[PDB]
């Protein structure tokens, strides 16, 4: 119950080894650590 | 205006072929499209390869048996057709228009340059139309 | 996909006609483009454009042809009309990939 | 009458905090850091 | 016949003086400095 809400999935956009090409990386990230700006962070 | 090729007849089973000319090469930086008109079931649209070369976009309910080719020596569309059902039994117009090369979500570096971008563009509008071409098929 | 209505017209000529494209997804990019636009065949001839995006008419149609509307809801006004101006009309949406045509407004003079 | 055309008015676009967007940033420049190429300068 | 392949004309779109346009530019890279994914080289 205590983790409603504290951790976020924030799937992201990053260019891979060439510049041109690029790729949907996915990281973790804690609440206290993003804020919003489904719904976007930053 | 545009010029298209004659009417054809073709025995369903072969394939058949459609040319669309411009006069000299005054349409180059408009793009390309061509539609279909079955009487009584309103126009399709058959699709495009804009006009840079970079989009060959066909609806994947023609993609199959439709082929789309711009040959830019003759300035020339080609539209080739493989299955030749008696649905295919209709007028088929090549079109010259203009399209709008938005940007959208565009990945800038840190330094400031452009990593790349999805620049999805829309079509605007098809100002030139050919003269229609009847395609007949029959058994 | 798209539609609109009525699905046939007859309006008595020098009187003004209006026919509604509804689409079924935004239609707008950012705020005011409105990639639709209005396609006209006359019998037996290569369909002709009356206006882009919506807005503003092409060069080479007179100011009989007027188009207007946002979102969804899109409505054509052709006011004094003649027999010059009898046939099928239709609507293109740019906005989504693959672009599609409507099923076809006959208009006839009453 | 002194400083006719020696102050631009330059609008462009910038990359901002983030950098999935950009910005239009407007600014004045002297005329003596900008070089043509409205018109385009930089 | 020492020379078959061993050296590769590259061209790549480096962005010019300004950092907003592209510019097709080519070159000249020795085989061992290209890595395959005409075809495309990094
Ligand atoms: C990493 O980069 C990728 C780029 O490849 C990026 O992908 C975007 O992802 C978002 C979110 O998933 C997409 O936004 C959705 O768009 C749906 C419809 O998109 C149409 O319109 C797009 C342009 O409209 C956007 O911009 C205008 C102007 O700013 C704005 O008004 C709009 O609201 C919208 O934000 C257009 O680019 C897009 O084109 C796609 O499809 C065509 C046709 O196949 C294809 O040719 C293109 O290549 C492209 O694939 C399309 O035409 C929209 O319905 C959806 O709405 C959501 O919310 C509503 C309401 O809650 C829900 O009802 C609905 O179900 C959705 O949940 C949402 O807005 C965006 O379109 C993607 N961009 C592209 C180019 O595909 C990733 O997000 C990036 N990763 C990040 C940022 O983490
Ligand atoms: C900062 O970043 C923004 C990013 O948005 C940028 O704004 C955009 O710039 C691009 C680049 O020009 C614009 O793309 C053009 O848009 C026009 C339409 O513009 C009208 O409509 C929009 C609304 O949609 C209005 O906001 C705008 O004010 C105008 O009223 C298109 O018509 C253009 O298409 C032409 O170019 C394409 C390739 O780029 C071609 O594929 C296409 O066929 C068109 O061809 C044109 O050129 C041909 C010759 O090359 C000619 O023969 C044709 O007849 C035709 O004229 C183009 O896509 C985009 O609209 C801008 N706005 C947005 C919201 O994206 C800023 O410019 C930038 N600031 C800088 C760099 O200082
Ligand atoms: C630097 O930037 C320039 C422009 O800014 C780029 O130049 C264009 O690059 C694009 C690639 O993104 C090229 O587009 C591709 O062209 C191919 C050429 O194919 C020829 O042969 C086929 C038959 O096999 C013909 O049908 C076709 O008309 C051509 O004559 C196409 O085959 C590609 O099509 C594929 O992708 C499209 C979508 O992109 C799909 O719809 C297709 O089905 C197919 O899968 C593609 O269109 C374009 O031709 C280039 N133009 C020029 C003038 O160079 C540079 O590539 C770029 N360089 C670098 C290093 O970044």
């Given at each position: 119950?205590?983790?409603r ?15 041109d ?7 973790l ?11 976007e962070?930053? | ?33 061509w ?53 295919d039994?209709?007028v ?30 829309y ?13 007949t098929?029959?058994? | 996909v ?9 309006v ?22 409105n ?34 509307g946002?979102?969804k809801?899109?409505?054509?006004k052709?006011s004094?009309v ?9 609507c ?6 693959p672009?599609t ?10």
């Amino acid at each position: 119950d205590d983790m409603r809400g504290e951790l976020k999935n924030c799937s992201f956009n990053m260019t891979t080894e060439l510049r041109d090409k690029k790729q949907k990386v996915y990281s973790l990230f804690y609440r206290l650590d993003v804020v919003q700006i489904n719904k976007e962070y930053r | 205006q545009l010029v298209q090729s004659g009417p054809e007849v073709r025995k369903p089973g072969t394939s058949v072929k459609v040319s669309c000319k411009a006069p000299g090469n005054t349409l180059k930086t408009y793009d390309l499209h061509w539609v279909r008109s079955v009487p009584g079931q309103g126009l399709q649209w058959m699709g495009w390869i804009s006009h840079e070369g970079d989009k060959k976009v066909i609806v994947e309910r023609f993609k199959a048996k439709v082929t789309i080719d711009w040959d830019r020596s003759t300035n020339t569309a080609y539209l080739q057709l493989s299955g030749l059902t008696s649905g295919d039994t209709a007028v088929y117009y090549c079109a010259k228009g203009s399209k709008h090369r938005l940007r959208d979500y565009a990945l800038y570096d840190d330094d400031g340059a452009l990593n790349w971008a999805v620049d999805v563009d829309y079509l605007s509008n098809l100002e030139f139309w050919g003269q229609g071409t009847a395609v007949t098929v029959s058994s | 996909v798209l539609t609109q209505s009525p699905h046939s017209l007859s309006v008595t000529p020098g009187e003004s006609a209006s026919i509604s494209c509804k689409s079924s997804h935004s239609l707008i990019h950012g705020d005011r483009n409105n990639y639709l636009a209005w396609y006209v065949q006359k019998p037996g001839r290569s369909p002709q454009l009356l206006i882009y995006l919506a807005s503003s008419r092409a060069s080479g149609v007179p100011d009989r042809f007027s188009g207007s509307g946002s979102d969804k809801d899109f409505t054509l006004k052709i006011s004094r009309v003649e027999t010059e101006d009898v046939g099928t009309y239709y609507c293109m949406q740019g906005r989504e990939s693959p672009w599609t045509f409507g099923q076809g407004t006959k208009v006839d003079i009453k």
